Amino acid sequence: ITGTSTVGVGRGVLGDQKNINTTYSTYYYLQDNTRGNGIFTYDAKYRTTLPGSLWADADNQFFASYDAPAVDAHYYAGVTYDYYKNVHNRLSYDGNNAAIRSSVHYSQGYNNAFWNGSQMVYGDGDGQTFIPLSGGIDVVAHELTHAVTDYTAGLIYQNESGAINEAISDIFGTLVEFYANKNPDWEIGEDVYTPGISGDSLRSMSDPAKYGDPDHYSKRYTGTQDNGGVHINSGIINKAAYLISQGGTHYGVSVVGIGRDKLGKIFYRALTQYLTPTSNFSQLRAAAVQSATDLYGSTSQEVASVKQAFDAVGVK
């Protein structure tokens, strides 16, 4: 909507206070004009019709329990925008400052969040498996990274290409989590998962097997569930990315870590220059090797570490 840019204050899902960019015109709206063509957050009102209503508030204070998911969806979309712009010189998900739209309070008891090809959508959770999912910066960044993938590599959401798609979202969701620098880790979804249990998460990059996901190609899932294992076999790629950044010895193969920023540079280049809709795990290895060669040279430590990490997870 047309109005003037303002600054509201509210509390997120975890009870933390933050400022949010709003727009005033009779009401205060969750519309951040400071980033690209805007960030816009909507109320789905417990329904599945999308997007719902642009979020309107009478006083520019967002401290109600109902408000919390909206505050975080809005704020963490901004953080994600800032990561891509400042770290990768990418203007929104399309590279041309596309407006970022999100809806909260999707359905009732919905234990998930997703990019639907056009916008972000967040459930509130059932209160036991999940609390509202926009409370997790890694969740917000995971699903906005699907938008980036859709506009770039276009990885089809099935089998190995789909597992790469998922892993790319877990990798950049994590890198955004580190960028924001609040309790960062190599785990996925911890901030909003199982409020009754400390220290767990939905997936782990550091040890995918913690949650039953493979950490080596020899353990890959070959059946039809989960679109051919897209959230399962992502563990093989997530482990390779973790090893590239952090290092380690895995199934007897030693990897010299090169740190998170180089991991991000290599994988962002691979995603945006070298992956295609049908890329498999072997082709991802090749893309990462070429990306690292472009950036650092064929004889570099960075290239050597990318090779060892894929060796360590059984991907040739």
Ligand X SMILES: COC(=O)[C@@H](N)Cc1ccccc1
Give the list of residues 6+ apart from residue 138 with CB closer than 8 angstroms, or none: 170, 173, 174, 176, 177, 188, 189, 190, 191
- Looking at residue 182, its amino acid is K
Q: Does 212 bind ligand X (CB under 6 A)?
A: yes
Q: Cβ-closest residue to ligand X?
A: 212
Partner in contact with 112, chosen from Zn ion, ligand X, Ca ion, none, beta carbon below 5 to 8 Å by kind: ligand X
- For the bound state, the minimum distance from the C-beta of residue 148 to ligand X, rounded and expressed in Å, comes to 15
- Interaction with ligand X in 218-237: which residues (CB under 6 A)? 231-232
φ, ψ of residue 260 to 5 degrees: the values are: -65, -40
- Rule CB under 5 A: say whether 169 interacts with Zn ion: yes
Does position 211 bind ligand X by CB under 6 A? yes
Q: Any known ligand binding at 194?
A: yes
Binding segment (CB under 6 A) for ligand X, from list 31-39, 108-116, 250-258, 285-293? 108-116
Per partner kind, with CB cut-offs from 5 to 8 A, the member of Ca ion, Zn ion, ligand X, none near residue 65 is: none
Burial zone of 49 (CB within 10 Å; 0-12 exposed, 13-18 middle, 19+ buried):
exposed
Positions 133 through 172 that interact with Ca ion (CB under 5 A): 138
Residue pair 188/205 in contact (Cβ under 8 Å)? The answer is yes
**119 CB-near residues (< 8 Å, 6+ apart):** 50, 51, 101, 102, 103
231 is annotated as an active-site residue: yes
For residue 57, state whether it binds Ca ion (rule: CB under 5 A). Answer: yes
User: Which pair of tokens denotes residue 293?
Assistant: 């060669």
| Tokens of residue 25, six digits | 């015109």
For residue 296, give both structure tokens: 């650092």
Piece in contact with Ca ion (CB under 5 A), picked from 60-68, 139-147, 214-222, 291-299: 60-68
Q: Is 157 in the site for ligand X (CB under 6 A)?
A: no
Q: Which two tokens stand for residue 150?
A: 């859709």
Q: Which residue is nearest to Zn ion (CB)?
A: 169
Buried b (16+ CB within 10 A) or exposed e, 216-244: bbebbbeeeebbbbbbbbbbbbbbbbbbb
Query: Is-catalytic flag, 105?
Result: no
Binding site listing for Zn(2+)? 142, 146, 166
What is the contact surface with Ca ion in residues (CB under 5 A)?
57, 59, 61, 138, 177, 183, 185, 187, 193-194, 197, 200
What are the catalytic residues? 143, 231
What is the contact surface with ligand X in residues (CB under 6 A)?
112-114, 136, 138-139, 142, 188-189, 202, 211-213, 231-232
